[PDB]
Amino acid sequence: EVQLQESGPGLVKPYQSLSLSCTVTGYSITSDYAWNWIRQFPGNKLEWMGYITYSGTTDYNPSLKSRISITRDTSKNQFFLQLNSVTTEDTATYYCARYYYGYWYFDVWGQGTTLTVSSAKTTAPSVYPLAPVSSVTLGCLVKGYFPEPVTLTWNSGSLSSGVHTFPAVLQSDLYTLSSSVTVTSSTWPSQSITCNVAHPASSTKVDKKIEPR
Amino acid sequence: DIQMTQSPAIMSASPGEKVTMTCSASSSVSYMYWYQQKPGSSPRLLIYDSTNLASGVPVRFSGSGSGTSYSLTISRMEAEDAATYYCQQWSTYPLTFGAGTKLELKRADAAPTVSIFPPSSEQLTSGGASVVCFLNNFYPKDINVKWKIDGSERQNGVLNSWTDQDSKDSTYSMSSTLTLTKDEYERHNSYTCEATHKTSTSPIVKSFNR
Numbered sequence: 001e002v003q004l005q006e007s008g009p010g011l012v013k014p015y016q017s018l019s020l021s022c023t024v025t026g027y028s029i030t031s032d033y034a035w036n037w038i039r040q041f042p043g044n045k046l047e048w049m050g051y052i053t054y055s056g057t058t059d060y061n062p063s064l065k066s067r068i069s070i071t072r073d074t075s076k077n078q079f080f081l082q083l084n085s086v087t088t089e090d091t092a093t094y095y096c097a098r099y100y101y102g103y104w105y106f107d108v109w110g111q112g113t114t115l116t117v118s119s120a121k122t123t124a125p126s127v128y129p130l131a132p133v134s135s136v137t138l139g140c141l142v143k144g145y146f147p148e149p150v151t152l153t154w155n156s157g158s159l160s161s162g163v164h165t166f167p168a169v170l171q172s173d174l175y176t177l178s179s180s181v182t183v184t185s186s187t188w189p190s191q192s193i194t195c196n197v198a199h200p201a202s203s204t205k206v207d208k209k210i211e212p213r
Numbered sequence: 214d215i216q217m218t219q220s221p222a223i224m225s226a227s228p229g230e231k232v233t234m235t236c237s238a239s240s241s242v243s244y245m246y247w248y249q250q251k252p253g254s255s256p257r258l259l260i261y262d263s264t265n266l267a268s269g270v271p272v273r274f275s276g277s278g279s280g281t282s283y284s285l286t287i288s289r290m291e292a293e294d295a296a297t298y299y300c301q302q303w304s305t306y307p308l309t310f311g312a313g314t315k316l317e318l319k320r321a322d323a324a325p326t327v328s329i330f331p332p333s334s335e336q337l338t339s340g341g342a343s344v345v346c347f348l349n350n351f352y353p354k355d356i357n358v359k360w361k362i363d364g365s366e367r368q369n370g371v372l373n374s375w376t377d378q379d380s381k382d383s384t385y386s387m388s389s390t391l392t393l394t395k396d397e398y399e400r401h402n403s404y405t406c407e408a409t410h411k412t413s414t415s416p417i418v419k420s421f422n423r
Contacts, residue, residue, distance in 0.1 A: 046299070046310040062307045063214070104303060105246060105258045105267075128336050130345055133328035133419070137347060141333075141390070164349060164386045166374040176372055178388045180328070180347045213334065 002026040004035070006096055006113035008081075010201055011147045014117055018083040022096030022110060023076075030054050030074055034099045036106070037070060037081045039092040041114075047092075051099060052079050091116045116147045120173045124202040125150055129195065129210045136185050138210045140195035143176040151198040154181050159193070188212075215239045217300055217311035227319040232287040234314040236278070236300030243304035245283040247276060250313070251296045252377060259298070260285065292318060295378070320383040324412040325351035327419040332398065342398035344391045346406035346419065350384045358389045359407035359416070367391060399423070 008020030022035065029035055036051035050061035052070045061068045067084040083090065094115060098108040123146040130139030142150055152165050162182035168175045183193065194209040218237040226232050236245055247260040258267045260276040263283065273288045287294055295318040300311045325348035332342035348356060354375060360367040375387040389406065405420040 044312040046312065048308050048310070103258075103261060105248075105261060106256075107258065109255045126336070126339070128333040128343070130330040130333065133330065134326060137326070137328045137349070139328075139330055139345060139347060141336075141343060141345060143343070143392075164347075164376055166376055166386070166388045169372045169374050171372055176390065176392075178345060178347075178374070178390065180349065180386075180388070182326075182349070 002098070002108050004096055004098065004108055004110035006094060006110045008094070008113055008115060010114065011116050011118065011122065012086055014087055014119055015085055018081070018086045018090065018115060018117075020081045020094055020096075020113060020115070021078050022080070023078040024098075025077075027098075028074075029072060029077055029079060033101055034058075035079055036097050036099055037079075038095045038097060040095070040112075041092045049081065049094075086117050088117050091118070114148065118147070118173070120146055122146055122202045123174060124204040125175075125197060125199050127195065127197045127206050127208045129208050130180075131210055131213050132188065135182065136188050137180050137182045138188065138193055139178060139180045140197070140208060140210075141176075141178050142197055144174050145199055145202070145204075146174055147201055148175060149199075150175075150177060151196075151200075152177070152179050153196045154179075155192070155194060156196060159183075214307055215242060215302060215305060215309055217302065217309055219298075219300060219311035219314045221314060222312070223315045223317065225317040225319040226290045228290050228292055230290045232285075232290050232294070232316065234285045234298060234316070236283040236285075236311050238281045238283070238302060240305065241280050242283075242302040244302075245276070245278065246301040246303070247285050248299045248301065249296050250299065252380070256299070295383075317378050318383045320352055322412050323350060323352045323384060324410060325349055325356065325387075325408055325417065327406060327408055327417050329404070329406050329419045329421055331404070331421055331423075337395055337398075340395045342393050342395050344393075344404050344406075346389045346391075347386070348389070348408050348417075349386045350379070350382070351386075351410060351412070352384060353411045354378075354385045356387065356408055356410045358387070359405075359409070360389065360391050361403070361405040361407065363401045363403055 034051040034053045037049040069082040072079040093112045097106040100107040125145030128141040132138040165179040168177040216239040244263040248256040250256040297313040328347045330345040408417040
């Protein structure tokens with residue numbers, strides 16, 4: 001089956017250019033259809049950016065076709081997006097999609113890739129444990145990191161029930177995120193419960209055990 | 214270059230109800246398209262050409278409209294219909310989409326399980342102090358939390374975050390973090406987190422003293 005996966009930088013400085021790729025498997029970009037580039041967020045607003053057809057080029061870009069360029073590498077089977085003189089207004093998550101012919105619709109979409117345009121510097125998170133309250137709900141606090149995202153698992157992903165990871169809130173160029181996990185009173189503190197945090201952008205990974213302090 | 218407005222932005226419905234969302238176009242469009250986007254999954258085409266149902270789409274969905282007004286209706290709502298729906302057009306175009314309508318599932322009221330956390334010693338050594346309050350598994354996403362330090366309501370320095378509706382039980386959760394300086398924290402004694410929700414006339418109070 002056809003999958004489609006995006007790639008590119010997570011953070012880009014203002015006025016620089018942005019480059020993203022879309023790799024497709026299970027189908028060749030030369031056979032048929034036009035595999036496009038679309039962007040969404042933050043307020044859910046969407047914008048179709050352009051497409052490149054199976055015959056190459058024949059591409060179109062919305063009227064904002066002045067800083068954009070979509071190209072392809074038929075030997076590696078992937079198309080690319082080049083946006084220039086990027087600004088803060090360009091932070092969003094990008095999706096590459098395939099437009100089915102005849103039936104005017106997009107039938108295959110990628111996983112999406114988020115791009116932040118900011119002069120702010122990457123900052124590693126401080127991970128704090130939160131030892132527990134009422135039938136034992138424990139927590140983890142990840143604060144002061146930039147940019148998004150961080151990955152948080154409880155006990156190497158083994159524990160998934162009762163978990164609630166709350167979305168990151170930006171408080172002056174820095175982010176703060178948290179998570180709670182509810183377990184039975186008999187489980188903890190005898191059975192260890194550690195919080196696993198990973199922040200790729202600053203290459204930070206830390207395991208924080210919730211001790212009954 | 215038509216702008217598409219989907220109203221209502223969000224709505225809830227219980228299984229068995231008749232649902233109807235709308236898509237307005239700044240100027241006439243010749244037949245709209247509707248996509249359904251289940252949380253945590255690719256969008257799927259639902260309706261093509263204003264009324265034509267795509268294959269694999271349940272008969273309960275219908276589409277209608279003409280000119281600058283288009284609507285999506287679900288005769289009978291099913292749990293599995295909770296998702297975001299987008300309208301799209303291509304007539305007088307560059308093609309454009311709408312910002313979607315989030316159809317959430319209505320369910321029985323549920324009060325939150327509140328938990329409070331003093332700041333970790335590790336954090337204190339750095340000179341900062343955050344008090345966290347978790348309010349978990351409650352229905353009307355609408356809840357008001359209050360932070361009180363020695364009786365006074367602290368309204369600044371708080372960050373609130375809710376999770377999307379829970380896949381397994383149509384419930385919500387939220388966290389409220391009160392960040393302070395170590396020295397303002399130690400200059401006080403009681404830290405309270407108060408929740409006011411539809412389920413209780415009196416608020417839920419969770420506190421701790423240093």
